[PDB]
Amino acid sequence: TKTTFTISDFSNGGTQYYWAGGNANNLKNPISSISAVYDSATGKISWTVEYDPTTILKSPALKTLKTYTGIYIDTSSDSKLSTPTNVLIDGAATNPVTNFYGNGSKGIEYVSKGTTKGVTKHTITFDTAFSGRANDLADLEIKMLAATTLSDPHFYEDGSKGNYGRYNGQTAPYVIANDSGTAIGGYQVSGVNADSIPSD
């Protein structure tokens, strides 16, 4: 049977990633939530990311644009977690963009096939097969970064460039776009918190 995990179930290991635009003193979080439903019987995990670039991309000068959304996902540090399947955005399909910067990041940007007039909330979902038992969720390593682009569907915003600011008075890392991506944010999982792991 199934268990739902949220960001708060990953607190202990791994990292939330924010966006400074032209302003490391005004960090912003474009992730409303991340939610993963793990089925102990099959090992399937179903992810749901709620992306909201709406606050970063406030401007009305953007209303006429045909935007693309994308999710970069890397499952390469876990040998028990397989690449993702059925990657959707707003329930629609995606094209994969593979790393064209030769920076050694493994892992892939799944970009929407369709555009969106203007800037809106989005709901990204995908599946990842997991070949371990519940206990091995203490070592689940996966990284996810939502991005928007204003016109171009060919982008790869892994989190490879970045730096640190303040968000709720911490030292919060933020992403720097490789190119033309914007409102980037996301999370790196590095183990499900010891005490949110289920019964198995």
From Swiss-Prot:
Inducing factors: Low expression in early log phase, it increases until stationary phase (at protein level). A monocistronic transcript.
Observed effect of gene inactivation: Loss of fimbriae on the cell surface, loss of adherence to saliva-coated hydroxyapatite beads (SAH), an in vitro tooth model.
Subcellular location: Cytoplasm; Secreted; Secreted, Cell wall; Fimbrium
Modified how: Glycosylated; occurs within the cytoplasm. It is probable that most of the Ser residues in SSR1 and SSR2 are O-GlcNAcylated. Sequential glycosylation by sugar transferases are able to generate complex sugar polymorphisms.
UniProt superkingdom: Bacteria
Region called Sufficient to block adherence to beads, residue ranges: 1-200
Annotated domain remarks: Has short and long regions consisting of (E/V/I)S dipeptide repeats. These Ser-rich regions have 28 and 1000 repeats respectively.
Function: The major structural element of fimbriae. Required for adherence to saliva-coated hydroxyapatite beads (SHA), an in vitro tooth model. A Fap1-dependent increase in adherence is seen as the pH is reduced from pH 8 to pH 5.
Stated family: Belongs to the serine-rich repeat protein (SRRP) family.
Name of the protein this chain belongs to: Fap1 adhesin
